Coordinates of C-alpha atoms in Angstrom, one line a residue:
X6 CA -7.0 -25.1 20.4
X7 CA -9.4 -27.9 21.3
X8 CA -10.7 -31.5 20.8
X9 CA -14.2 -33.3 21.1
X10 CA -14.3 -37.1 21.9
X11 CA -16.1 -40.3 20.7
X12 CA -16.2 -43.3 23.2
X13 CA -18.0 -44.9 26.2
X14 CA -16.1 -47.6 28.2
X15 CA -12.4 -48.8 28.6
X16 CA -11.9 -52.5 27.7
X17 CA -13.8 -52.0 24.4
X18 CA -12.4 -48.6 23.6
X19 CA -8.8 -49.8 23.5
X20 CA -10.5 -51.7 20.8
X21 CA -12.4 -48.6 19.5
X22 CA -9.0 -46.9 19.5
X23 CA -7.5 -49.2 16.9
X24 CA -10.5 -48.9 14.5
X25 CA -9.8 -45.2 14.6
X26 CA -6.2 -45.8 13.5
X27 CA -7.1 -48.4 11.0
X28 CA -9.5 -46.0 9.4
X29 CA -6.6 -43.5 9.2
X30 CA -4.9 -46.0 6.9
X31 CA -8.0 -46.8 4.8
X32 CA -8.5 -43.1 4.2
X33 CA -4.8 -42.9 3.2
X34 CA -5.3 -45.6 0.5
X35 CA -8.1 -43.6 -1.3
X36 CA -5.6 -40.7 -1.4
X37 CA -7.7 -38.7 1.0
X38 CA -4.8 -37.4 3.2
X39 CA -6.5 -34.8 5.3
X40 CA -9.1 -37.3 6.5
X41 CA -6.2 -39.6 7.5
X42 CA -4.4 -36.8 9.4
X43 CA -7.7 -36.0 11.1
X44 CA -8.2 -39.6 12.1
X45 CA -4.6 -39.9 13.2
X46 CA -4.8 -36.7 15.4
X47 CA -8.2 -38.0 16.7
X48 CA -6.5 -41.2 17.7
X49 CA -3.8 -39.3 19.6
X50 CA -6.2 -37.0 21.5
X51 CA -8.4 -39.9 22.3
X52 CA -5.6 -42.0 23.8
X53 CA -4.8 -39.0 25.9
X54 CA -8.3 -39.0 27.4
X55 CA -8.0 -42.7 27.9
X56 CA -4.8 -41.9 29.9
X57 CA -5.9 -39.1 32.3
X58 CA -9.3 -40.9 32.9
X59 CA -8.0 -44.4 34.0
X60 CA -7.5 -45.2 37.6
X61 CA -4.2 -47.0 37.1
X62 CA -2.0 -46.5 34.1
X63 CA 0.1 -49.7 34.7
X64 CA -3.2 -51.4 34.1
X65 CA -3.4 -50.3 30.5
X66 CA -2.4 -53.1 28.0
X67 CA 0.5 -53.4 25.6
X68 CA -2.0 -53.1 22.7
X69 CA -2.8 -49.6 23.9
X70 CA 0.7 -48.1 23.8
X71 CA 1.0 -49.7 20.4
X72 CA -2.0 -47.9 19.0
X73 CA -0.8 -44.6 20.6
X74 CA 2.7 -45.1 19.2
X75 CA 1.5 -46.2 15.8
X76 CA -0.6 -43.1 15.7
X77 CA 2.3 -40.8 16.6
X78 CA 4.3 -42.4 13.8
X79 CA 1.5 -41.7 11.3
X80 CA 2.1 -38.0 12.0
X81 CA 5.7 -38.2 11.0
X82 CA 4.6 -40.0 7.8
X83 CA 2.1 -37.3 6.9
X84 CA 4.1 -34.4 8.4
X85 CA 4.2 -32.7 5.0
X86 CA 0.4 -32.0 5.5
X87 CA -0.1 -32.4 9.2
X88 CA 2.5 -29.8 10.1
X89 CA 0.1 -27.1 9.1
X90 CA -2.0 -27.8 12.2
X91 CA 1.0 -27.7 14.6
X92 CA 2.9 -24.9 16.2
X93 CA 5.8 -23.4 14.1
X94 CA 8.1 -25.6 16.3
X95 CA 7.6 -29.3 15.8
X96 CA 9.3 -31.7 13.4
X97 CA 9.0 -35.0 11.6
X98 CA 11.8 -36.5 13.6
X99 CA 10.3 -35.4 16.9
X100 CA 7.3 -37.5 16.1
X101 CA 9.3 -40.5 15.1
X102 CA 11.1 -39.9 18.5
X103 CA 7.7 -39.7 20.2
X104 CA 6.4 -42.8 18.5
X105 CA 9.6 -44.6 19.7
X106 CA 9.2 -43.3 23.3
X107 CA 5.5 -44.1 23.8
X108 CA 6.0 -47.5 22.2
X109 CA 8.8 -48.4 24.6
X110 CA 6.6 -47.4 27.6
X111 CA 4.3 -50.3 26.9
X112 CA 7.1 -52.8 27.2
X113 CA 6.2 -53.1 30.9
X114 CA 2.4 -52.9 30.6
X115 CA 0.6 -56.3 30.5
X116 CA -1.0 -57.9 27.5
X117 CA -0.3 -59.5 24.1
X118 CA 2.9 -58.0 22.7
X119 CA 2.4 -58.6 18.9
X120 CA 1.0 -55.1 18.2
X121 CA 3.5 -53.4 20.4
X122 CA 6.5 -55.1 18.8
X123 CA 5.5 -54.2 15.2
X124 CA 4.9 -50.7 16.5
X125 CA 8.5 -50.6 17.9
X126 CA 10.3 -52.1 14.9
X127 CA 8.4 -49.6 12.6
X128 CA 9.3 -46.5 14.7
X129 CA 12.9 -47.8 14.9
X130 CA 13.4 -48.3 11.2
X131 CA 11.8 -44.9 10.5
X132 CA 14.4 -43.4 12.9
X133 CA 17.0 -45.1 10.8
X134 CA 15.8 -43.5 7.5
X135 CA 15.8 -40.0 9.0
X136 CA 19.2 -40.6 10.7
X137 CA 20.7 -41.5 7.4
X138 CA 19.3 -38.3 5.9
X139 CA 20.7 -36.3 8.7
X140 CA 24.1 -37.9 8.2
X141 CA 24.2 -36.6 4.7
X142 CA 22.8 -33.0 5.1
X143 CA 23.7 -32.0 8.6
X144 CA 27.3 -31.1 9.0
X145 CA 27.5 -31.9 12.7
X146 CA 27.3 -35.5 11.6
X147 CA 29.2 -35.4 8.4
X148 CA 32.1 -37.4 10.0
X149 CA 30.3 -39.8 12.3
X150 CA 30.2 -43.1 10.2
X151 CA 26.6 -43.8 9.2
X152 CA 26.9 -47.4 10.4
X153 CA 28.0 -46.3 13.8
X154 CA 25.1 -44.0 13.8
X155 CA 22.1 -46.1 12.7
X156 CA 23.3 -49.5 13.9
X157 CA 22.0 -49.3 17.5
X158 CA 18.6 -48.7 15.9
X159 CA 18.8 -51.5 13.3
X160 CA 19.8 -53.8 16.1
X161 CA 16.7 -52.9 18.1
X162 CA 14.4 -53.2 15.1
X163 CA 15.7 -56.7 14.3
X164 CA 15.2 -57.5 18.0
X165 CA 11.4 -57.1 17.9
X166 CA 11.0 -58.2 14.3
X167 CA 12.5 -61.7 14.9
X168 CA 9.7 -62.7 17.3
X169 CA 7.1 -61.7 14.8
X170 CA 8.6 -63.8 12.0
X171 CA 8.5 -66.9 14.1
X172 CA 5.5 -69.2 13.4
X173 CA 4.7 -69.2 17.1
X174 CA 3.5 -65.6 16.7
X175 CA 0.2 -66.2 14.8
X176 CA -1.4 -63.7 12.4
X177 CA -2.9 -60.4 13.6
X178 CA -5.0 -57.6 12.0
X179 CA -2.4 -55.0 12.2
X180 CA 0.3 -56.9 10.3
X181 CA -0.8 -55.6 6.9
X182 CA 1.2 -55.3 3.6
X183 CA 1.1 -51.6 4.4
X184 CA 2.2 -51.9 8.1
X185 CA 5.3 -53.5 6.7
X186 CA 6.5 -50.8 4.4
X187 CA 9.3 -49.7 6.8
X188 CA 10.9 -53.0 6.1
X189 CA 12.1 -51.5 2.9
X190 CA 14.5 -49.4 5.0
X191 CA 16.0 -52.4 6.5
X192 CA 16.5 -54.1 3.1
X193 CA 18.3 -51.2 1.4
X194 CA 20.4 -50.7 4.6
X195 CA 21.7 -54.2 4.4
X196 CA 22.2 -53.5 0.7
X197 CA 24.7 -50.6 1.1
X198 CA 26.4 -51.6 4.3
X199 CA 26.4 -55.4 3.6
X200 CA 30.2 -55.8 3.3
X201 CA 30.2 -55.5 7.0
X202 CA 27.8 -58.2 8.0
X203 CA 28.4 -61.9 8.0
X204 CA 26.7 -63.9 5.2
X205 CA 25.0 -65.8 8.1
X206 CA 23.7 -62.6 9.5
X207 CA 22.6 -61.3 6.1
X208 CA 20.8 -64.6 5.7
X209 CA 19.1 -64.6 9.1
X210 CA 17.6 -61.1 8.6
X211 CA 16.9 -61.3 4.9
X212 CA 14.7 -64.3 5.9
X213 CA 12.9 -62.5 8.8
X214 CA 11.9 -59.9 6.2
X215 CA 10.7 -62.4 3.7
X216 CA 8.8 -64.4 6.3
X217 CA 6.9 -61.3 7.5
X218 CA 5.8 -60.0 4.1
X219 CA 4.2 -63.3 3.3
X220 CA 2.6 -63.6 6.7
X221 CA 0.9 -60.3 6.3
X222 CA -0.9 -61.7 3.3
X223 CA -1.6 -65.2 4.7
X224 CA -5.3 -65.2 4.6
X225 CA -6.2 -66.8 1.3
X226 CA -8.8 -64.1 0.6
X227 CA -6.6 -61.0 1.0
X228 CA -7.7 -58.8 -1.9
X229 CA -5.4 -59.3 -4.8
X230 CA -4.3 -55.7 -4.5
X231 CA -2.6 -56.4 -1.2
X232 CA -1.1 -59.8 -2.2
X233 CA 0.7 -57.9 -4.9
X234 CA 2.1 -55.2 -2.6
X235 CA 3.8 -58.1 -0.6
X236 CA 4.9 -60.5 -3.3
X237 CA 6.6 -57.7 -5.0
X238 CA 8.5 -57.1 -1.8
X239 CA 9.5 -60.7 -1.5
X240 CA 10.6 -60.8 -5.1
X241 CA 12.6 -57.6 -4.7
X242 CA 14.2 -59.4 -1.7
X243 CA 15.0 -62.7 -3.5
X244 CA 16.5 -60.9 -6.5
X245 CA 18.6 -58.6 -4.3
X246 CA 20.1 -61.7 -2.6
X247 CA 20.8 -63.4 -5.9
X248 CA 22.5 -60.2 -7.1
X249 CA 24.5 -60.3 -3.9
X250 CA 26.0 -63.6 -4.7
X251 CA 26.5 -62.7 -8.4
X252 CA 28.5 -59.6 -7.3
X253 CA 31.1 -61.5 -5.2
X254 CA 31.0 -64.4 -7.6
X255 CA 33.0 -62.4 -10.2
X256 CA 35.3 -61.1 -7.4
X257 CA 36.0 -64.6 -6.2
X258 CA 38.4 -64.1 -3.2
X259 CA 37.1 -67.6 -2.3
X260 CA 36.9 -69.0 -5.9
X261 CA 34.1 -71.3 -4.9
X262 CA 32.0 -73.2 -7.4
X263 CA 29.6 -73.4 -4.5
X264 CA 28.3 -69.8 -4.5
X265 CA 27.1 -70.0 -8.1
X266 CA 25.0 -72.9 -6.9
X267 CA 23.7 -70.8 -4.1
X268 CA 22.6 -67.8 -6.2
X269 CA 20.9 -70.1 -8.7
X270 CA 18.3 -71.3 -6.2
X271 CA 17.7 -67.6 -5.2
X272 CA 16.8 -66.8 -8.8
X273 CA 14.3 -69.7 -9.1
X274 CA 12.8 -68.4 -5.9
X275 CA 12.4 -65.2 -7.9
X276 CA 10.9 -66.9 -10.9
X277 CA 8.5 -68.7 -8.7
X278 CA 7.4 -65.5 -6.9
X279 CA 7.2 -63.8 -10.2
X280 CA 4.6 -66.3 -11.6
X281 CA 2.7 -65.6 -8.4
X282 CA 2.6 -61.9 -9.2
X283 CA 1.9 -62.4 -12.9
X284 CA -1.0 -64.5 -11.7
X285 CA -2.6 -61.9 -9.5
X286 CA -1.9 -59.2 -12.1
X287 CA -1.4 -60.4 -15.7
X288 CA -0.2 -57.0 -17.1
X289 CA 2.1 -57.7 -20.0
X290 CA 4.8 -55.2 -19.2
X291 CA 5.8 -57.5 -16.3
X292 CA 7.2 -59.9 -18.9
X293 CA 10.3 -57.7 -19.0
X294 CA 11.2 -58.5 -15.4
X295 CA 10.8 -62.2 -16.1
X296 CA 13.2 -61.6 -19.0
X297 CA 15.5 -59.9 -16.5
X298 CA 15.7 -62.9 -14.2
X299 CA 16.1 -65.3 -17.1
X300 CA 19.1 -63.4 -18.3
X301 CA 20.6 -63.2 -14.8
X302 CA 20.1 -67.0 -14.7
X303 CA 21.9 -67.7 -18.0
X304 CA 24.8 -65.5 -16.9
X305 CA 25.8 -68.0 -14.2
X306 CA 24.5 -71.4 -15.1
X307 CA 27.3 -73.9 -15.8
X308 CA 26.7 -75.5 -19.2
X309 CA 26.1 -73.8 -22.5
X310 CA 23.0 -75.8 -23.3
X311 CA 21.2 -74.2 -20.5
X312 CA 22.5 -70.6 -21.0
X313 CA 21.4 -70.9 -24.6
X314 CA 18.0 -72.0 -23.2
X315 CA 17.5 -69.3 -20.5
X316 CA 18.3 -66.7 -23.1
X317 CA 15.8 -68.2 -25.6
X318 CA 13.2 -67.7 -22.9
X319 CA 14.0 -64.1 -22.0
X320 CA 14.1 -63.4 -25.8
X321 CA 10.5 -64.8 -26.1
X322 CA 9.5 -62.9 -23.0
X323 CA 10.4 -59.6 -24.5
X324 CA 9.0 -60.5 -28.0
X325 CA 5.6 -61.3 -26.3
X326 CA 5.9 -58.3 -24.1
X327 CA 6.0 -56.2 -27.3
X328 CA 3.6 -58.5 -29.1
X329 CA 1.1 -57.1 -26.6
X330 CA 1.9 -53.4 -27.1
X331 CA 4.8 -52.7 -24.7
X332 CA 7.2 -50.3 -26.2
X333 CA 10.6 -51.9 -25.8
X334 CA 13.4 -49.6 -24.3
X335 CA 16.6 -49.6 -26.3
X336 CA 18.3 -52.2 -24.1
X337 CA 15.6 -54.7 -24.7
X338 CA 15.3 -54.0 -28.4
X339 CA 19.0 -54.6 -29.1
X340 CA 18.7 -57.8 -27.2
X341 CA 15.9 -59.3 -29.2
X342 CA 17.8 -58.3 -32.3
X343 CA 21.1 -59.6 -31.0
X344 CA 19.8 -63.1 -30.0
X345 CA 18.0 -63.9 -33.2
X346 CA 21.4 -63.5 -34.9

């Protein structure tokens, strides 16, 4: 039924305001959730004071509405726990809604837009995840086509993401491998409902995503932990695109020798990014996914000399993976056995 406050002046407390949110996320990483919720709620209550107490609101910067938005969204993320402090009436989706609303308000406000855009595209994508769930379990929506439903939101998310991917928008603190997690929602959405989007479109977006993940980990000294979080994502992206081409390659309505040539380069982009991950984390169980790509590569390459070669590498990958104490699942064991025959 109350809230105490920690600040002193305006220009440097829109800055204070972010530190508070940032701390929310740092407390999250150490698994301390309640602390995070307390920081998140703090941030909200504090932005409220900042609101009432300023002389003109239209003065307040884009970067403020972003912080405020990004804090509201954090409640929907930790709603499981945070709901225990709220009236018996609020909901995860209402906060995603709030986050969207407050973010949008800053569109007019003056200031750098980088933070506010990320704040939007995040809230939007999060509304898409929830919307998809509602389509499946709410019966009001059981017959509204899920594309019809979530598209308007995907469209908006892409809209603010595109600017950020551009090299013109240079790096900023709040573009972190974590801040980008919602991008996972955009990926698996293009995955299900892809047979509805032009290959050019699919390519435009699935490159905006790739671009962003890498850019969040640009600074050469990003701790290796974070570099991993992002490279994994880029890998997941590259492989998913290669598996896209491989899927219609066997269908072959177009019968083009071209699109085997297209998928190939996507899988070397996966082998590349893999070695980057294997470098920041040399765990030997990873070898199985290097095997996985090799096999996917032999399954399309033209000439038998190369197929035979790719397989000989995936075979060695799994042998070594086991030679270092990984317990091979059945699939892998009856591959190693099958090749050496």
